[PDB]
Amino acid sequence: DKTFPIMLNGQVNGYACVVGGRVFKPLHVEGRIDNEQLAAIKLKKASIYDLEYGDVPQCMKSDTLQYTSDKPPGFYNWHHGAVQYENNRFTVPRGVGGKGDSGRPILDNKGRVVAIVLGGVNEGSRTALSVVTWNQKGVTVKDTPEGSEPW
Amino acid sequence: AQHTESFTSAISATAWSWIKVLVGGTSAFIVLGLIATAVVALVLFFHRH
Numbered sequence A: 001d002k003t004f005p006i007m008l009n010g011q012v013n014g015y016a017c018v019v020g021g022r023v024f025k026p027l028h029v030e031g032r033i034d035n036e037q038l039a040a041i042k043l044k045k046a047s048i049y050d051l052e053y054g055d056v057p058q059c060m061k062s063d064t065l066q067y068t069s070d071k072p073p074g075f076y077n078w079h080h081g082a083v084q085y086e087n088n089r090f091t092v093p094r095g096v097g098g099k100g101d102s103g104r105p106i107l108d109n110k111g112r113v114v115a116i117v118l119g120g121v122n123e124g125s126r127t128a129l130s131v132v133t134w135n136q137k138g139v140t141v142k143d144t145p146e147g148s149e150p151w
Numbered sequence B: 001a002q003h004t005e006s007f008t009s010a011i012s013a014t015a016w017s018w019i020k021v022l023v024g025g026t027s028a029f030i031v032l033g034l035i036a037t038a039v040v041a042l043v044l045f046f047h048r049h
Helices: B015-049
Strands: A001-009 A012-019 A023-028 A042-044 A049-057 A072-076 A082-087 A089-095 A106-107 A113-122 A126-134 A140-143
Touching: A001 A023, A012 A113, A023 A106, A042 B015, A072 A106, A089 A113
Parallel strands: none
Antiparallel strands: A001 A012, A012 A023, A023 A049, A042 A049, A072 A082, A082 A089, A089 A126, A106 A113, A113 A126, A126 A140
């Protein structure tokens, strides 16, 4: 697999994922990654992005997710189904997302990572998501709506 | 002695030069770190916007 849930007391409180050869876990999600090979790597902190990262082992470097900074208007998908990307924010229908979906990546129509969801905001019709994405120049940025809560 | 001593009476120009270099060097180094700290935060802000 490519997504590795993070377990603290035998329950999943977030998910680790492997993108482009780096293992990304939310910084606010405490626990052990549900793996044996990827759990042994020391992780570097990226608290400005509320993430931690490390190098993928040699045997896992090829079986990882690719990502893109190209985000044309339209529909994107993730574990729970479709995601709307409009007005520069990723949003899901009310109640679709919630606590525990921390580190879950959002995929395009080709299965490429466009953002990593860290939290969200419940709006009138859809929940806005706090994500780590790549801007128009491909540089890592923290894309969050006003009042987002860690999931 | 006819004259009177003071704290700075015995400090030569060479000693003042070393004091100025020491104090100026350390202060400039800290200021360099603070300017770098301010600029990186400004650069990161522009990444978001």
